[PDB]
Amino acid sequence: SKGEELFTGVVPILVELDGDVNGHKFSVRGEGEGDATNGKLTLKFICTTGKLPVPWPTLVTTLVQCFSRYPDHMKRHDFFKSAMPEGYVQERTISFKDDGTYKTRAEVKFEGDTLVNRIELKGIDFKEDGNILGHKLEYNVDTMESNCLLNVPIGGTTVVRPLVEDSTSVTAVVTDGYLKMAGMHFGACDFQRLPSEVTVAKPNVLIALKMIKRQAYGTNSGVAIYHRSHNVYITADKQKNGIKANFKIRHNVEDGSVQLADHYQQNTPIGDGPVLLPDNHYLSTQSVLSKDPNEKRDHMVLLEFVTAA
Amino acid sequence: SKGEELFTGVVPILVELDGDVNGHKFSVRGEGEGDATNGKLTLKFICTTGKLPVPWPTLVTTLVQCFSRYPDHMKRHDFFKSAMPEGYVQERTISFKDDGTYKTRAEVKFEGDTLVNRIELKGIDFKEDGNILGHKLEYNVDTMESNCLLNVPIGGTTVVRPLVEDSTSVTAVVTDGYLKMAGMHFGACDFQRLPSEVTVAKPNVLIALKMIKRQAYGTNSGVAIYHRYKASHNVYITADKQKNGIKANFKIRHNVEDGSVQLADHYQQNTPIGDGPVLLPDNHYLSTQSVLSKDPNEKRDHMVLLEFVTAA
Amino acid sequence: SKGEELFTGVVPILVELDGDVNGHKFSVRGEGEGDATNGKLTLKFICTTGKLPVPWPTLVTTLVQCFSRYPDHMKRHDFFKSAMPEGYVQERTISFKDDGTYKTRAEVKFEGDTLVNRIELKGIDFKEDGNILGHKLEYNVDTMESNCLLNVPIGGTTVVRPLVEDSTSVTAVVTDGYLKMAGMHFGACDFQRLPSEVTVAKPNVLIALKMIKRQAYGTNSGVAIYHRYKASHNVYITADKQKNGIKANFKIRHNVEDGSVQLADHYQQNTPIGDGPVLLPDNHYLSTQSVLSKDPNEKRDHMVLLEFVTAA
Amino acid sequence: SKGEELFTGVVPILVELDGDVNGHKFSVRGEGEGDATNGKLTLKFICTTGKLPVPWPTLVTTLVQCFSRYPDHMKRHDFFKSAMPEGYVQERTISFKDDGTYKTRAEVKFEGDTLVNRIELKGIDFKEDGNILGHKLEYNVDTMESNCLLNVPIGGTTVVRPLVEDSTSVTAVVTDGYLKMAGMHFGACDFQRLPSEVTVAKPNVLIALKMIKRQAYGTNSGVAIYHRSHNVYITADKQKNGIKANFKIRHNVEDGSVQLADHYQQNTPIGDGPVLLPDNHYLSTQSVLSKDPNEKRDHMVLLEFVTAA
């Protein structure tokens, strides 16, 4: 689709949000850049007022899905870049479990060669003492997200991407004929007598773990290795000529529980044009929250990678 | 210590609970066996009344810590088996966050060669549409516990233990010169050119130094010292000399079906049933791993529990 | 194991070394006693020739690992005391970074009730103005070792052990409303208003996942797995079945006087002196802490050594 | 002294260095701000050429000592701010042990309200395979510096400063009548029988550690606590109307040793004016090296605190 070509390279991003939550007024401004080729997003956000009413993770989602990486086979389903350069409007309602709701309206458009995202956010009935207003959330986007980075050295340069768990792996340690596997003592066993296959029993799946590598630390001691909703669900909305998306975010609260955020969103094109009405699909998002060490004002540094499926 | 010898082998276990939660009467009876040598507990519980008003995970804790494996150096701190064969009494108060409370009193004693744990439970101020009374909990003991089993075939027989899942592992897939590491697209790379080592950058972790001592040298002058101590899911056990027993604290994060977790604040105290020299333990804790399953051919509301407890 | 019983108590030790470093002949003789129960080694060494061409820390290692304390679970891996009373032979090669090398052969055996360690040492290609021959080293075994002693009075007698200095501690000084924490000016603060907890932010540490297995699915396609293993200063000991002995590796960072450190790459191998069933150990290591002092009333070039070795 | 008043507040800093080491040409440009009140320095440096010939720690020193915090009693000895706003010239010779030398000439002056530091650096005979050119240094300024940060919450805001060791502290753990103190087993002892004072024997000082706090973990088990060249040496140089300074930097190299850097420097005022000729004293410096997480070009983020004595 024409209009996605302006996302071939890196695009500068400017985000401007004005929010008032339960009588607390604030405004956030963020700048950075997005590489739609890999789904890379590097942004820095600052509260212009100073005082932060809500914790960053609640509005991380609310704070440019056009930079989502759409693989080639579904390139005919990317509504976001097809709405560009005229842009689209994104309306969100975020219901926090045992708390109030956010209602947000944003315009994502192109100003010259920059990508501007302007938001109006309002909080309706949020408890003044709660996980939201009490900043009790653990500076984490979702509970299933590892906030770690993974650096792969390739051709002299390290490539850094968020870290997902792609499979299950269990290590076995045999000492003088006694086996300890996954923090449990399995009793007497000889290192040579370690099985080639081990089984794991999930409430629905029977997984088989095969021995990958073994190393002998002694005559009878050694080590062996055995190995084998969250996403944003997007559907089309022909009557409004846009898309409707649903998802849930489980913010880690400090006391061990999680705060639920039900995101219901709908996007409609800003100007008359032929947008791509997609099939039902989803976006997988991975986020890493850090802070600028030399920065003193209340800020957030975001690294985000989105892919489609 | 005498009285711990009765746990050298496998011991048959009988658990009997009569509960009343928000005016809902029920009774659970369970049978099985425990091997204190490995900390193994294998039991099957059935609701005799039939329909269970609260979900099984809420009562897993209330439904025999004597079978906890105490290592040799801590064998002088196992109060539970030292109270035997006369037994002890276990009083629990379970405060559920944003919900009611359980108050339970149980007697754990030896009846003949069987180990009987008899419980009276009462649940108060429970929301009828709450997670507890609504069975909204996800049939999981704790959120950090994987309810999976790990079976290792050894010497012709498979040995089954709970899954701890503490390892870290990343898989790399190179297809036609493009690399995918842990479900992410890393770009162009050749398989032979894959690096021998990869690095992971964990989030900055903040070591906490607590104020140890303070001394005031003046009206607005003084000195303070901050230091890191030598030491959430585990059951923290302390002695209670004045009552000649033990007091334990912990928290359990039950998985709620919608993705959240329900907190259960367990505050318990155990005191010996009969006059005797019990072991007054030092501060320690029990690490517990539990697996909940169901008999596919069973019709009554039931729970099959496998549990492993260790001390530290 | 038989032969380790000879180390139940304190054993008198005699060490005798004849060395030739770059054509410089010298001889060191040392006496003392070792308590294998605690890993204690207390010796006094004197250069019989008088002036020592190389500094004492270089020869501390070359100058009886049988006195290393092996815990109960590792008592089947202590090759040194298992080779006794016939003894073993210890061959060492010490490569000093940007300097020459030591080649040493020693016999550690039992002469009567004494434990004798006899050494032949040869030093080759040493810079005459180098750190070694110039005595530029700072009379320290390793740079991470504090040469301090810690004396705890217990039951009327002080017990002395080397200082490990592994704790972290920060002191706060408030003067007239201004705060100083760890030698830094933190600005205005009131002593009563001092926080209960302070946080320290350590530098980002990079966990390393090594490639465990690789399998090629095509010309430019394959799969790789990266994982973190379960496990520098310590002496790493491995078995050597083909030679029926052990081989050990380690590195020692001697403190140079100008602030730098001189590296000493120790590669050693021990083989039993007499025919017998020695213990072929699993891979393990020895953690060593040494304290070097001098007798103030002594005139000959000497060294007083206190050493504690443990296994893991 | 007049002219130090312009350092009462925060001053923007711009650093420009052109270096050629053993035929490798590069240029570094850095920007940030310095607060002379507390000695705070927050800077970010970037290699403009791309390819970094030498590791950052070697030139960290070479890359604005006017921001050094001089306490009140020695405020008559601060030559640096007394040379301002006209500035001074700083000449350095840095001899690396078992390697060549750096020769650097810099002008530290005021351009408007900004503080400009312009440097010419040249490396004479540095081994191509060495700790310097091989980037073998451990991203650490000095071996005695802990690269950690210490955050003290005061009045709702955390103050972050480099972490020094101000005293010696030893913890004792008694379990069932056996004592382990500072990673050593002292044998049998009862927790109630723990001594009030412990002694430490240094090669020159006999330190006494008193018990600070004790906590009982059981009937006979518990824990107790016992507690009790690098700097830049500056002298005056009347004949040249400036100062001469000496110091040594022990960079941690990766293999465990340290690389020595002998800094010999001299500062002379740029313009005719009454500078302060100081008594012999020294500056204590603490540095923390980090990196901007969203930054990809070869960069360094520096936090530095200097005090006088």
Curated annotation (Swiss-Prot), chains A, D:
Effect on the protein upon substituting S284F: In H9; increases fluorescence at 395 nm excitation
Record InterPro entries: GFP, GFP-related, Green_fluorescent_prot
Phenotypic consequence of D99E: In mut1.27; shifts fluorescence lifetime from 3.03 to 2.85 ns
Consequence the record notes for mutating V64N: In R10-3; matures to the red-emitting state with excitation and emission maxima at 555 and 585 nm, respectively
Annotated effect of mutating Q65H: In P4; leads to no detectable fluorescence. In mut2.2; shifts fluorescence lifetime from 3.03 to 1.94 ns. In mut3.3; shifts fluorescence lifetime from 3.03 to 1.88 ns
Record note on what altering N231K does: Increases fluorescence at warmer temperatures such as 37 degrees Celsius. In Esmerald; leads to brighter fluorescence. In VisGreen; leads to brighter fluorescence
Phenotypic consequence of F45L: In mut3.3; shifts fluorescence lifetime from 3.03 to 1.88 ns. In R10-3; matures to the red-emitting state with excitation and emission maxima at 555 and 585 nm, respectively
GO biological process: bioluminescence; generation of precursor metabolites and energy
Keyword Disulfide bond appears in the UniProt entry: no
Effect listed in the UniProt record for changing D237V: In EBFP2.0; shifts the excitation and emission spectra to shorter wavelengths and increases quantum yields compared to BFP
Gene3D superfamilies for the chain: Green fluorescent protein
Tissues where the protein occurs: Photocytes.
Keywords tagged on the record: Chromophore, Luminescence, Photoprotein
Effect of I249T: In P11; increases fluorescence at 475 nm excitation and at warmer temperatures such as 37 degrees Celsius. In Esmerald; leads to brighter fluorescence. In VisGreen; leads to brighter fluorescence
Biotechnology note: Green fluorescent protein has been engineered to produce a vast number of variously colored mutants, fusion proteins, and biosensors. Further generation of mutants led to more stable proteins (at 37 degrees Celsius for example) with brighter fluorescence and longer fluorescence lifetimes.
Quaternary structure annotation from Swiss-Prot or TrEMBL: Monomer.
Name of this protein: Green fluorescent protein
Taxonomic source organism: Aequorea victoria (Water jellyfish)
Gene: GFP
